[PDB]
Amino acid sequence: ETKKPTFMDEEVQSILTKMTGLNLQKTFKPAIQELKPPTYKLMTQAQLEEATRQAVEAAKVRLKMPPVLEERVPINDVLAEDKILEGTETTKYVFTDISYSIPHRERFIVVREPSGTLRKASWEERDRMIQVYFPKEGRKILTPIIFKEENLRTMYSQDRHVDVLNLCFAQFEPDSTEYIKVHHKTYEDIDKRGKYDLLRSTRYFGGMVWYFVNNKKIDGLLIDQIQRDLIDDATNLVQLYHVLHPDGQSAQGAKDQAAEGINLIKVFAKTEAQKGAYIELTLQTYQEALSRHSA
Amino acid sequence: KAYRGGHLTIRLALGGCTNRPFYRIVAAHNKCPRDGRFVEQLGSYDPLPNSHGEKLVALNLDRIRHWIGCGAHLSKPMEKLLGLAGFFPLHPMMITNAERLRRKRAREVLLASQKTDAE
Amino acid sequence: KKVRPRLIAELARRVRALREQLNRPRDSQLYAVDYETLTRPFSGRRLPVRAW
Amino acid sequence: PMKGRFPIRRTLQYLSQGNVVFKDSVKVMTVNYNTHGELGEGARKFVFFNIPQIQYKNPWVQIMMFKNMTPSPFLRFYLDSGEQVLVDVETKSNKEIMEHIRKILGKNEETLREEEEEKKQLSHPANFGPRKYCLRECICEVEGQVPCPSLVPLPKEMRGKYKAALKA
Amino acid sequence: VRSSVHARWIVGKVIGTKMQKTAKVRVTRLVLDPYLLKYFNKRKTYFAHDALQQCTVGDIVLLRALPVPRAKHVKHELAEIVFKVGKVIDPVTGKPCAGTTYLESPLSSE
Amino acid sequence: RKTRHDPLAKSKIERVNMPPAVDPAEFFVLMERYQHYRQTVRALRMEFVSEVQRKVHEARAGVLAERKALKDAAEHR
Amino acid sequence: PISPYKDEPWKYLESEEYQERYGSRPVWADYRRNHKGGVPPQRTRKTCIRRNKVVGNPCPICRDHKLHVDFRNVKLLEQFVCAHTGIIFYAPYTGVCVKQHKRLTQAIQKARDHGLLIYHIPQVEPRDLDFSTSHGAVSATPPAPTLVSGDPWYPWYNWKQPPERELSRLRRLYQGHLQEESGPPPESMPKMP
Amino acid sequence: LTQGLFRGLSRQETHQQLADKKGLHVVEIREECGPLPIVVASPRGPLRKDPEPEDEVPDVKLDWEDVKTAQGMKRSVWSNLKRAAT
Amino acid sequence: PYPPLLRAMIIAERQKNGDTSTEEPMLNVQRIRMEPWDYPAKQEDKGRAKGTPV
């Protein structure tokens, strides 16, 4: 019949990429790390543009939007229950297959419980054991205290929402429960304080939009884009919401009125947007400003 | 060093420090020292529980199946680790010791009951 | 690649092998057992208890 | 300053820039070039610059060079199977000569990528041993495990010194 | 195919034909200097089996490893004389040459 | 440890080791277990040997291995 | 002496007393070690304070008792962190003793973990190429027939009583070295009441 | 040493002077800044359209100490020693 | 029956390759000819005591 587009669909990928934008300054911000004497080249105007083009190409690789996944189902599987071994050992044994040429999501990690029951390791145990034998840079075996509520709120108070997402991505798998909660909590703080600009020109911008659309709370994001003269992205936000919610007041209203461009926001503001009056006032303010520049 | 006869054996090589045991599962010659030269390390075994109350055992199954198919023998403690992992059937000694432990505790219950009842 | 040979090492090896055949012990000597002490007079090693 | 003209040739950085890795079939490479003549200009520059790069990446290939024995420069390769490969290098720059021999007798980038991956499997991250061969020496280095007694002393219950005293 | 000789194919210069059915061949390889990082010729002497004794002192020969060493030092055999001494045939054109000048013009046979 | 040429200790000249007493029920049950456990392991061992032999043969004259050999020879010519 | 800023270490750096003494430059700027030769020893003194007694030439941390090394005192810790590279200066650089440098390293690390100190956080690639969770290692493997019926994985796991004739054969084989015959073991592990 | 120090520092060529002489942009490449090209100096006059000839092998004189250090062949117990801030 | 870990991996291999079957893998222990421990061995391959007398 009709299938709602996913996060990795090309239409969604193209729209989200345009809403992100390649800022070579931010994508290649001078990092605070060990420094080396920079090299210098004598380049013409054509060569300088070519070098700028390569920086644009390298920016896209760095701005690749991570895939969005649902929470993984907890693993509760028992291979065998040997009652003979019950009570012989007071500590459970964890066995991890450390074969190199095996994907980390296809390794057999089993736990021999003290009761004698052999069971597959849970997701939290599997991620911990993988780091023990196959360490990854930036990932700690024990969960850092940075992910506590107080520590995260401290990061939010410092407008370092990108750092939180970078820390969460390196530590937790995308389908993990902790990964979802940290990302969702980060997104809520962004919307409440209107800090959408922090995630602009970052690979994590697409996830923020995807979270907002699925909760019908793109009211805050739409307001910010209009105030920053991003109507083209603002219209795409409304169109993406209509695509993912065909059976809505705004989606049906758009079809009835054949609204396009700025008219799409007006239909959405009156029908489904909670702060419709604020959006209309914001859109009216921009429209008057644009008209003066036209003359 | 070319020993007279001998064979490869998958055994545990003790590491760590005093009172901190740690065994590395290696495939070495039978005549080699316990912590001496080995052909290929096939995993690790940490008998001391960690902060999660777990004993970490690593089994390079692809290489373990390779060396066993090349004629490498298995030490008795190694045959129990495989049995605990389910890679091998439970060693008869593990089953037999479980039965002995049950008998030992069963007799302790009878002694405890008599002390409470009689006195 | 010339190395000083060891003639005596080869000479001793052949002498030991030859004497082990000429002076080989016989079954009556190797497997004789003193039924009183249950020890073999050839080597003086006690037989296992279960075989007594 | 480093002695000789073009001192960059005697650096490991320059010698490792050679993109020509001969196949297992190639055994002996002979270079015949002319010391004079504008047509053999590429051959002289190939010997001056590219020969050290080729030998460095192919330490087991014999390279013997002959000067002023034939009217025109050429390259000859002696394969293991007995086939002799002849390459003409007259009126061709050293870069062209470098790419031609790589095309006909050099391993492609796909083969070189595969060879490097094989060496990666040799160093297993899960293995424990000296820092020369393994990333970690003991399981005590793994956070969450019982640390080394040298740094953090063990409880008296877990030490054999007090185990015997309590029992006897 | 299998041979116990380490050097399978080697190209060297004959420096002596004073032995019966054996040509003393000098082989040079480029060996890296670990400190100077410059290649210098290293010369090793190989004995080659020459059934017809057609080698002449001063020519370039191709040596093929024997499956087994026929003598204590003879491990290779004369495969092909690459450059005869004073009678070099140019591989590119096939015409005889004396140094950098063709003895027979390549245009003789078009 | 001691070598073959080291003289025997005087204190152990008269030492005799008494074999342990046998529990008839536990001995027979355990003896059967060692006859089943080694049967399963030997069957497992045979499969492991075959896999090693198959992998060597597949790398030597396997269909995929031979396909690459002919492909490289075709490219070389 | 008892510093009143122990409860709130960050208050000291904001006082007028701090401005008069140090100013806008780091505390260790005016400190110079005393040592023989032109090359200083690669390790500073172990501690400037021994048994509540201060050495003749205290380190910048030890020379001021009002400077408390705490993770909350973020401003002080930045003086010991390179502003261009983010690394912590070694002991010979600033001149602090080994004991206080170790305290600084722990405090700086503690500050970074809580997010109070800004440090470079690199962007990493995802660990797994494929995120599929359909493989049997992470999925639910179908149960074996033995597991469903509750039987042991092998028949010989459970205790089977040997035949009477076989028991008599062992008794005859081991005359004079027999233990008390053992029946089937308890089905479950007993516990002390 | 004093007179030599002031002599070399007085004769150093700035990036702006180099850009004016060559008539080309001077682009700074920083590893911390990734592949982002940074223009530090641009010629005030006309800009050349022909790129500089990319020589395959530069004919420059290399100090052996710099090369030896780069290859790790230079061991010295007196190098990279921890010293007071300057 | 296979040991619990080996059976799971073999079944997991079938699902990975797309094969769908409910058959339980089993070991062909029929080939294994278990022998009594008191079965006579090869006297030909057995050694002999050394010639040193006491």
Ligand SMILES: [Mg+2]
């Ligand atoms: Mg057996």
Ligand SMILES: [Mg+2]
């Ligand atoms: Mg067989």
Ligand SMILES: [Zn+2]
């Ligand atoms: Zn101090």
